[PDB]
Design a protein around this ligand. Structure first.
Ligand SMILES: [Mg+2]
Ligand SMILES: [Mg+2]
Length: 757
DNA sequence: CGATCACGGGG
DNA sequence: GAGTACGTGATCG
């Protein structure tokens, strides 16, 4: 009867057991299923071949792996009936061990659905959807503070504070005496970590909210717990938090709970040049949050002075993490429900994967064999594919800019023109739609797999919107608002998904055709805007920016709002143009490279700011000054003078060496590097002096004056002697400051050579 | 040139 | 864990 919050599998006597984690009227419940079997499909040249194929074996865990059962099944592949063999295996881990040995067989045409994780395969095949119902979950935010010194190995310093927050308040656990009402003083780091364990086990939250807990709080807690020889039984089955390598980074799971890391969530939802907790909190709640930096924390801890400030910082970190979690969780819960996969997985995935997860479930429901993910070569061939058929933007600084969004136009185009990989250039097709300019043909004889699903999504959203108008219950209304927004997000991701290189249902011709049909409406919007005195400053497939040159801002807003209302009255069906926002000033460099400033003075950029540790402060500071001179002062001449002054100061050795430090992490043992960059050259010298260089250590260096590649001229920041060493002014000018500002100033007709005296 | 390698968030 | 993240820009070899 309960709400499914997660699913996984355990192995018992070498056999897999599925676990379904549920919340039923406030109670945690686990259901176990020992009956679900792993499988793959094999398309054979002939039915006689099954006798050779069913006899294929592999090895795993010292035992030989066999196909347990085979079953001839009738399915659909690319809108055509197909006969494949369902090959059953005992354990999920048998699938990577045997799949290549089945694929290699001369009688095997191809294999299918050989990389779907067991718990995700279970939820699809059994028709189970997470987050259904009105079941109320409990939340706890968790955060930590540590003792850090520049360039230390990860986990060297102790955890000095652990903070948590829920509706009962925000609290701090520390092992140094601080006299504040929300601070619990314990005897040691060990006792503080054990107190966190107790809080989590006693509060028993369904959701543990963190800010970058995947890649900091939890790996750090695990490192220090290992060090101190203590366990972290945070799982509802008493298991420890589990670190999963998700790409080049990490993801942490806590069994029986939802580890909700806000960092990947917020990074997708909103646009910010830097997603610090303080920048994120202000963007959403319109309130400032003070940042207490690592060096200030270390100084207060070691000296024992100003610890009240550090404890307040730790408390506020947990407090706002709780507040942000409550804000961002409902939408992730509805997306999980819509796509039919747990929030843990859905909150950490791109919209492209959300679409694919939705499609894999619908393919099962429709008996449609899923196409395979591409191999490296295909993935690479897809990235190099050229699309025919979005001009260069207007130069200079523009005032009073309206932003219009086109994204809600594309699902309707996909549906009306039956744009799908299964309908593309079909043989013996009776009726078809021809894409303008690109000429791709889409069969009209049957609804395509993707248009069919999109149509149902848009219909469901219209029902939800109608139920919302007719509802008196504000609780149902709030919930229905989240559900209709989840459909809008998923439906507006299909256009992009067609061109997503990793997509199973990738279709270059589909994406191209949606673009070509879409363009007819964009050209109509542009002509209608220009007939109304508007100048289009920037236009791409997602939207445009426009202004009425020299008009009053309120007149621009009114005319734009009146235009959107008008055009939508002209557009058929669910084709919708949206007024996104207004900006006091802005400039446009190229496709998805631009900067704006709103009426409250907040700078908004896309594809231009360089806030990262592997760029020197002098380059990042100059870039901020250039954007401020342009957007806040409306003065490109001031911006050019700033660059010219900084470059001359660098030439005359007038810039502090501290603004010239470059930081780069060591990501593997030093011997595993194939290319030795400056930070590796610096690292190798440190290791030679006896420094324990380890992956995760961040190397700070300065590029000195001299001959050859910068690798041979980089010096460790701790070894830099201003009275002896001379930094490379030409490197900091040509490779740091000038690349940071040259893109920006190209929009104003400046080349890299005009930004020096 | 192609290949290799780094960034983000968090102390 | 029957998945891996991404997109982009600098520097090395
Ligand atoms: Mg999981
Ligand atoms: Mg903190």
């Amino acid at each position: 009867a309960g709400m499914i919050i997660d699913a996984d599998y355990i192995t018992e006597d070498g056999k897999p057991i599925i676990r379904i984690f549920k919340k039923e009227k406030g109670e945690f419940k686990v259901e176990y299923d020992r009956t679900f079997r792993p499988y793959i499909y094999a398309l054979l040249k002939d039915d006689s071949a099954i006798d050779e194929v069913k006899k294929i074996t592999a090895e795993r865990h010292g035992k030989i792996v066999r196909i347990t059962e085979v079953e001839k099944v009738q399915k659909k592949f690319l809108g055509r009936p197909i006969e494949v063999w369902k090959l059953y295996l005992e354990h999920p881990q048998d699938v990577p061990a045997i799949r290549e040995k089945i694929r290699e067989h001369p009688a095997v045409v191809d294999i299918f659905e050989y990389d779907i994780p067991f718990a995700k395969r279970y939820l699809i095949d059994k028709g189970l959807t997470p987050m259904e119902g009105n079941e109320e979950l409990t939340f706890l935010a968790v955060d930590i503070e540590t003792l850090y010194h520049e360039g230390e190995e990860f986990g060297k310093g102790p955890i000095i504070m652990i903070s948590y927050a829920d509706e009962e308040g925000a609290k701090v656990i520390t092992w140094k005496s601080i006299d504040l009402p929300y601070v619990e003083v314990v005897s040691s780091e060990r006792e503080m970590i054990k107190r966190l364990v107790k809080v989590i086990r006693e509060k028993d939250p369904d959701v543990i909210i963190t800010y970058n807990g995947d890649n900091f709080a939890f790996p750090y807690l695990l490192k220090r717990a290992e060090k101190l020889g203590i366990k972290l039984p945070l799982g509802r089955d008493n298991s420890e938090p589990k670190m999963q390598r998700m790409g080049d980074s990490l993801a942490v799971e806590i069994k029986g709970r939802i580890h909700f890391d806000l960092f990947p969530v917020i990074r997708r939802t909103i646009n910010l040049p830097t997603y610090t907790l303080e920048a994120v909190y202000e963007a959403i709640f319109g309130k400032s949050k003070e940042k207490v930096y690592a060096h200030e924390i270390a100084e207060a801890w070691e000296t024992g002075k100003g610890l009240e400030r550090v404890a307040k910082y730790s408390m506020e970190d947990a407090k706002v993490t709780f507040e942000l979690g409550k804000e961002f969780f409902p939408m992730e819960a509805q997306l999980a429900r819509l796509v039919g996969q747990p929030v843990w997985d859905v909150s950490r995935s791109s919209t492209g994967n959300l679409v694919e997860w939705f499609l894999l479930r619908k393919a099962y429901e429709r008996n449609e064999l899923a196409p395979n993910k591409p191999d490296e070569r295909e993935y690479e061939r897809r990235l190099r594919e050229s699309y025919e058929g979005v001009k260069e933007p207007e130069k200079g600084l523009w005032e009073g800019i309206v932003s219009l969004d086109f994204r809600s136009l594309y699902p309707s185009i996909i549906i009306t023109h039956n744009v799908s990989p299964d309908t593309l250039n079909r043989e013996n097709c009776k009726e078809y739609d021809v894409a303008p300019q690109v000429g791709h043909r889409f069969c009209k004889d049957f609804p395509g797999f993707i248009p069919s699903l999109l149509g149902n999504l848009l219909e469901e959203r219209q029902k939800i919107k109608k139920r919302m108008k007719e509802s008196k219950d504000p609780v149902e209304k709030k919930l229905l608002d989240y559900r209709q927004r989840a459909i809008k997000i998923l439906a507006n991701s299909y256009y992009g998904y067609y061109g997503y290189a990793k997509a199973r249902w990738y279709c270059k011709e589909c994406a191209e055709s949606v673009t070509a049909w879409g363009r007819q409406y964009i050209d109509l919007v542009r002509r209608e805007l220009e007939s109304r005195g508007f100048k289009v400053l920037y236009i791409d497939t997602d939207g445009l920016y426009a202004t009425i040159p020299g008009a009053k801002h309120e007149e621009i807003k009114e005319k734009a709002l009146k235009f959107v209302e008008y055009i939508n009255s002209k557009l058929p069906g669910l084709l919708e143009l949206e007024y996104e926002g207004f900006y006091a000033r802005g400039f446009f460099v190229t496709k998805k490279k631009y900067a704006l400033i709103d009426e409250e003075g907040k700078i908004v950029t896309r594809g231009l700011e360089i806030v990262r540790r592997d760029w020197s402060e002098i380059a990042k500071e100059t870039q901020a000054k250039v954007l401020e001179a342009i957007l806040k002062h409306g003065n490109v001449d001031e911006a050019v003078k700033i660059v010219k002054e900084v470059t001359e100061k660098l030439s005359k050795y007038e810039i502090p060496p501290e603004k010239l430090v470059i930081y780069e992490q060591i990501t593997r043992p030093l011997s595993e590097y194939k290319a030795i960059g400056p930070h590796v050259a610096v690292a190798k010298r440190l290791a030679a002096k006896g420094v324990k260089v380890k992956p995760g250590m961040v190397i700070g260096y300065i590029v000195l004056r001299g001959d050859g590649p910068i690798s041979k001229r980089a010096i460790a920041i701790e070894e830099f002697d201003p009275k002896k060493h001379k930094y490379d002014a030409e490197y900091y000018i040509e490779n740091q400051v000038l690349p940071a500002v040259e893109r920006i100033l190209r929009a104003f007709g400046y080349r890299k050579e005009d930004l020096k005296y």
